[PDB]
Amino acid sequence: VTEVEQKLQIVHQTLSMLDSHGFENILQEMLQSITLKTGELLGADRTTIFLLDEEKQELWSIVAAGEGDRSLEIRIPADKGIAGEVATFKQVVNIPFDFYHDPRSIFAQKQEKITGYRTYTMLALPLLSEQGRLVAVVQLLNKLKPYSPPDALLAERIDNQGFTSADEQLFQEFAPSIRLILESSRSFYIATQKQRAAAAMMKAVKSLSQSSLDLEDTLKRVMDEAKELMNADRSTLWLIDRDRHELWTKITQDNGSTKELRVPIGKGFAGIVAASGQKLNIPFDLYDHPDSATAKQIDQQNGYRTCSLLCMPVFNGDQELIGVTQLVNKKKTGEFPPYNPETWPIAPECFQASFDRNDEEFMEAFNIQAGVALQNAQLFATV
Amino acid sequence: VTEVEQKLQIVHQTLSMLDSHGFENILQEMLQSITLKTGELLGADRTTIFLLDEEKQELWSIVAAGSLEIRIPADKGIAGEVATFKQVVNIPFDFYHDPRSIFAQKQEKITGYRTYTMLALPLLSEQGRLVAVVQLLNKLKPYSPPDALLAERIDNQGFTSADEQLFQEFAPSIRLILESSRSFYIATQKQRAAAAMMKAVKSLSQSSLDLEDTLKRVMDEAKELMNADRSTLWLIDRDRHELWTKITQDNGSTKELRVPIGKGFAGIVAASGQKLNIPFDLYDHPDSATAKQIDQQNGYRTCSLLCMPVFNGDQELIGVTQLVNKKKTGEFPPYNPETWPIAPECFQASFDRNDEEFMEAFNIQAGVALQNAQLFATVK
Ligand SMILES: Nc1ncnc2c1ncn2[C@@H]1O[C@@H]2COP(=O)(O)O[C@H]2[C@H]1O
Ligand SMILES: Nc1ncnc2c1ncn2[C@@H]1O[C@@H]2COP(=O)(O)O[C@H]2[C@H]1O
Ligand SMILES: Nc1ncnc2c1ncn2[C@@H]1O[C@@H]2COP(=O)(O)O[C@H]2[C@H]1O
Ligand SMILES: Nc1ncnc2c1ncn2[C@@H]1O[C@@H]2COP(=O)(O)O[C@H]2[C@H]1O
Numbered sequence: 001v002t003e004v005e006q007k008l009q010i011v012h013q014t015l016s017m018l019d020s021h022g023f024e025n026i027l028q029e030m031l032q033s034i035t036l037k038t039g040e041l042l043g044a045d046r047t048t049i050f051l052l053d054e055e056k057q058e059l060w061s062i063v064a065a066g067e068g069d070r071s072l073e074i075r076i077p078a079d080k081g082i083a084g085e086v087a088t089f090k091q092v093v094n095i096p097f098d099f100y101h102d103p104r105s106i107f108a109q110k111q112e113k114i115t116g117y118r119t120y121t122m123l124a125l126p127l128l129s130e131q132g133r134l135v136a137v138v139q140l141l142n143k144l145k146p147y148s149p150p151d152a153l154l155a156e157r158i159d160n161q162g163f164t165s166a167d168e169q170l171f172q173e174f175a176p177s178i179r180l181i182l183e184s185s186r187s188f189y190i191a192t193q194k195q196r197a198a199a200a201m202m203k204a205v206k207s208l209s210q211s212s213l214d215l216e217d218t219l220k221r222v223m224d225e226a227k228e229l230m231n232a233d234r235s236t237l238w239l240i241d242r243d244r245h246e247l248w249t250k251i252t253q254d255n256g257s258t259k260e261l262r263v264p265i266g267k268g269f270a271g272i273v274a275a276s277g278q279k280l281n282i283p284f285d286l287y288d289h290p291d292s293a294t295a296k297q298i299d300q301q302n303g304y305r306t307c308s309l310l311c312m313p314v315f316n317g318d319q320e321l322i323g324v325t326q327l328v329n330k331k332k333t334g335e336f337p338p339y340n341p342e343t344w345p346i347a348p349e350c351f352q353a354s355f356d357r358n359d360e361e362f363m364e365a366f367n368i369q370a371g372v373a374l375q376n377a378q379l380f381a382t383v
Numbered sequence: 384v385t386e387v388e389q390k391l392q393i394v395h396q397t398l399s400m401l402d403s404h405g406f407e408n409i410l411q412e413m414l415q416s417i418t419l420k421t422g423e424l425l426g427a428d429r430t431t432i433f434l435l436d437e438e439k440q441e442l443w444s445i446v447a448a449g450s451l452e453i454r455i456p457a458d459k460g461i462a463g464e465v466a467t468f469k470q471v472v473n474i475p476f477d478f479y480h481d482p483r484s485i486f487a488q489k490q491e492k493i494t495g496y497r498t499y500t501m502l503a504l505p506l507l508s509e510q511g512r513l514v515a516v517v518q519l520l521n522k523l524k525p526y527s528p529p530d531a532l533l534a535e536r537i538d539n540q541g542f543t544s545a546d547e548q549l550f551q552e553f554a555p556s557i558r559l560i561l562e563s564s565r566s567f568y569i570a571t572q573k574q575r576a577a578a579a580m581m582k583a584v585k586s587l588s589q590s591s592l593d594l595e596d597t598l599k600r601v602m603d604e605a606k607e608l609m610n611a612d613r614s615t616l617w618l619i620d621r622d623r624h625e626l627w628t629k630i631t632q633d634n635g636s637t638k639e640l641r642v643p644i645g646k647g648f649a650g651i652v653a654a655s656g657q658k659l660n661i662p663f664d665l666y667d668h669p670d671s672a673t674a675k676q677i678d679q680q681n682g683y684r685t686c687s688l689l690c691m692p693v694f695n696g697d698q699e700l701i702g703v704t705q706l707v708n709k710k711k712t713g714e715f716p717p718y719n720p721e722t723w724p725i726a727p728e729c730f731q732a733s734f735d736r737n738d739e740e741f742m743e744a745f746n747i748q749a750g751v752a753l754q755n756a757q758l759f760a761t762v763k
Contacts, residue, residue: 001414001445001564004406006737007571008398014571014578015394023387023581030588030759031384037762062384130697176696177755184580185384191574192390196397198567202410203400205560209413317555318509358389365396372559379556380413383420 004202011195028062031181032071035063038138038174042167045142045154046117048074049178050083052134059083059137062182067116074115081107086124086137092168095122097160117141118154121162125171127179135182138171193364200365204372208380215377216250219370226327226366230310230359233329233351237314237370238263238270240322247274247324253302254338261298268294270324273311277321282309283354284330285347296345303341305329307351310359314371322374325367330355387581394574411445414560418448421517421553425502425546428521428533432557433462435513442466442516449520460486465503465516471547474501476539496520497533500541504550506558514561517550572740579744583751587759595629597756598749605706605745609689609738612708612730616693616749617642617649619701626653626703632681633717640677647673649703652690656700661688662733663709664726675724682720684708686730691742693750701753704746709734 031049039047046065053060061074078084082093082104099105099119108119121143127135140163148157211218219237227235238247247270248262265274269291273280284307286292295306308330314323329351336350414432422430429449433442435457442462444453457463461472461483478484478498487498500522506514519542527536590597598616606614617626626642626649644653648670652659663686665671674685687709693702708730715729 001410001560002407003568004401004410004564007568008401010571010575010740011394011398014575015391017582018387018578019391021585023585024385026585026588027384027387027581030584030762033588033762034758173758177758179696180580180751180755181584182384184577184584185387187577188574188581189386189390191570191577192393192397195567195570195574196393198563198570199397199400201559201563202406202567205413205563206404206406206409209409209416317558358392361389361393362396365400376556376559379417379552383416 027181027185031178032063034174034177034181038171038178039065039140041173042123042140042163042170043144043146043159044123044140044163045144045157047141048139050074050087050137050139051182052078052087052136054078059087062136065141076107076111081111082122082124083137083139086126086139087134090126090128090132090134092126093122093124094163094168095124096162097121097158120155120158121160123163123167123171125168125175127175127182129179129183135179135186138178140167143167196365197368200368201372203365204369204376207369208373208377215373218373218377222366222369222373223325226325226363230327230355230363231331232310232327232355233331235328236326238274238324238326239374240265240274247271251302253304259302263294268298269309269311270326273313273324274321277313277315279312279360280309281355281357281360282311284308284352287345287347300341300344305339305341305344305347305351307347308354310355310363312360312363312367314367314374316371316375322371325363325370327355327359327363329353330359410560410564414557415446415448417553417556417560418446421550421557422448422519424553425519425542425549426523426525426538427502427519427542428523428537429496430520431518433466433516433518434561435466435515445515455486455490460490461501461503462516462518465505465518466513469505469507469511469513471505472501472503473542473547474503475541476500476537499534499537499539502542502546502550504547506554506561508558508562514558514565517554517557519546522546572743575744576747579747580751583748583755586748587752587756588763590756590760590763593760594752594756597752601745601748601752602704605704605742608745609706609734609741610710610712611689611706611734612710614707615705617653617703617705618753619644619653626650630681632683638681642673647677648688648690649705652692652703653700656692658691658739659688660734660736660739661690663687663731666724666726679720679723684718684720684723684726684730686726687733689734689738689742691739691746693746693753695750695754701750704742704749706734706738706742708732709738 035047035049048064049062050059051062057078059076059078064071064074066072078087086093097120099122112118119141123140125138127138129135143159143163144157145159223235223237236249238249241248245265246262250258250260263271265271269280282289286295286306286309299305306328310327312325313321314325316322330353332350332353339348418430418432431444432446434445435442440457442455442457457466465472476499478501479488491497498520502519504517506517508514522538522541523536524538602614602616615628617628620627624644628640630638630640642650644650648659661668665685665688678684685707689706691704692700693704695701709732711729711732718727
């Protein structure tokens with residue numbers, strides 16, 4: 001309560017040390033240099049660092065050796081390959097010559113047909129936090145003989161004895177520095193997210209104390225601000241009717257009309273999010289999505305057209321879902337005439353656009369402010 | 384690695400929500416209003432919200448309704464009991480007949496307020512951590528004549544089970560204000576920590592300094608920002624059970640200092656793992672014997688000191704930093720060792736707890752350099 005201003009000065013100093021300095025590049029370039037040196041010292045032809053996108057269940061390479069020292073991004077399902085084995089069970093996997101005689105290599109053999117790279121031997125290592133969380137998977141490919149002709153083909157340059165126990169321990173000279181880059185950035189992301197959530201709650205307290213508006217009008221202001229920042233045509237807060245197992249809301253049209261909408265939980269994108277507690281971001285054109293039947297019927301009834309949609313859950317203090325926000329129709333940049341319902345179901349060019357991952361992160365502060373208001377506005381009014 | 388720019392834009396969103404809006408006053412005034420309403424509805428003469436300062440081990444009032452700041456040892460009184468055992472305490476009339484009231488009876492001689500009944504409730508998080516102690520005093524009769532004395536307007540049947548339940552209508556709102564602000568404070572400090580690690584990666588990637596000079600650069604920046612005369616990084620001889628460091632004197636000299644772990648402020652902090660902030664004048668402190676001897680040997684004088692632990696990956700101690708002598712702003716004569724033990728005016732100042740929080744970023748940068756500077760240079 002009494003440290004806000006001082007902590008804001010600390011935030012400003014954090015911005016001074018990071019803003020405009022190209023830290024994504026500094027961090028990625030250093031990671032690349034470490035990986036190169038790690039591979040050189042362990043005698044690997046190629047060295048890859050995989051990260052885990054747990055939202056999409058995929059391992060993707062933040063650093064990965066390519067042909068002619070120009071690198072590409074490898075992306076696989078998090079359960080597949082030796083990389084997936086290391087991600088799941090968090091053991092070192094050492095594959096001796098020849099990897100292709102191992103039945104675990106089937107996935108890799110299919111990927112070779114595309115990449116043109118041939119893996120004979122491998123050392124794959126989990127990078128773990130102190131708690132044992134997966135930070136990354138480091139994969140070293142094709143142990144090399146220390147001396148080969150400079151024009152030698154891969155099959156002649158490989159060392160049939162593969163990677164050794166001494167190589168695995170040598171990797172520990174580098175492991176801490178790799179962890180530092182990956183863990184420092186991750187920790188920055190999480191702290192920034194928790195800081196934002198806390199700030200959004202504080203801002204909601206300020207709104208409720210200073211306003212002489214209803215709950216209804218306070219929630220409208222939050223959704224209208226969200227809509228403006230994200231360049232959405234409309235926005236909506238759906239509330240739960242627990243008794244009937246339904247969502248409801250009151251929309252306002254281009255007319256001067258107040259219409260109530262009601263959808264069963266489980267039906268439509270709002271209903272799906274209410275049932276699952278998990279966001280959905282539906283890109284243009286929403287009408288091509290297999291779950292769009294509900295939108296099609298409501299659009300025709302309202303003289304509107306839903307083309308893109310960001311649907312996110314709103315929670316309690318104790319993880320109970322109490323609402324669902326929607327941003328409706330990311331606006332394409334430019335000037336266009338208003339939508340005319342006589343053209344249905346044709347999508348107007350003005351809504352040929354989609355919400356992205358940035359819109360999702362920026363919307364979260366508005367979701368939190370809505371939730372705080374729903375839970376606390378009645379007590380705040382009494383006071 | 385690939386989300387730094389997006390997250391920095393989130394930091395700017397956060398600043399736009401909070402900057403220049405007088406939030407310390409908005410939050411405190413709302414907390415005050417909710418406390419007033421809570422006391423009115425439960426019929427308490429007075430209502431207090433205590434917070435726990437963990438480092439000083441004190442309970443202190445952020446709000447009082449029915450106003451001064453009350454401050455007690457964290458283990459004393461009914462408030463202390465609720466902070467420790469985390470259960471509701473309902474005291475019937477008359478509180479003073481209860482042995483547990485002795486502390487309050489002594490506080491009463493000072494404040495002049497007389498407590499007859501009480502309901503003290505723990506406010507807890509999901510995990511069972513203490514957020515606050517809410518203490519309601521002196522249940523009132525629903526009607527008393529306009530100018531009735533306190534003894535005449537108290538209800539001698541005290542607070543009810545229903546009063547306890549009615550409090551839960553206000554508890555969530557109180558939690559919101561206290562927890563949201565706390566979460567912002569902790570997230571901000573953890574964000575600076577991670578930012579300082581990233582900054583170290585930048586420094587070590589673009590550096591041509593060896594380990595010794597890298598560590599000196601970190602400590603020199605630390606003393607510049609917090610206006611200390613000198614600064615020091617002690618390393619551990621984990622073998623002789625000793626600390627060592629190489630100081631540079633105002634002259635152009637190098638000198639090794641050795642302290643047994645356990646002795647001196649550096650040694651105490653190494654054996655315990657807890658920071659110490661020794662205010663002016665450090666020579667008045669019980670544990671200052673080592674500083675006094677070392678000062679005479681160096682022709683120096685230690686007047687204030689901020690001594691902090693430095694850890695590796697898994698929270699094992701790899702060093703101790705010191706900022707030495709917060710400098711008084713102005714222009715003063717150089718310290719002359721012939722004046723010993725007189726403290727010079729240039730060092731008549733102290734480090735505050737804001738310096739402690741800012742210094743953590745340099746502590747982390749030193750720890751990162753110890754573990755990574757040599758490898759980074761090899762790759763470069
Ligand atoms: N840098 C790289 N270049 C080409 N192929 C790679 C690279 N890194 C990993 N791979 C291959 O990608 C495969 C994914 O499945 P595996 O992990 O079983 O085996 C992996 C390697 O054979
Ligand atoms: N503010 C709004 N104005 C008009 N239609 C809306 C608005 N918000 C949501 N909708 C529509 O309401 C529909 C409910 O089901 P869906 O979530 O599938 O798709 C939703 C949109 O098509
Ligand atoms: N707002 C207040 N005004 C006067 N006295 C108070 C107030 N709040 C708490 N106290 C007294 O401070 C005492 C501290 O010890 P106890 O918790 O035993 O009992 C507490 C009350 O008697
Ligand atoms: N850079 C420095 N220059 C001179 N004295 C120092 C320096 N750093 C630490 N000291 C002194 O070294 C002493 C070691 O024991 P203490 O930590 O008790 O107190 C410390 C200070 O008095």
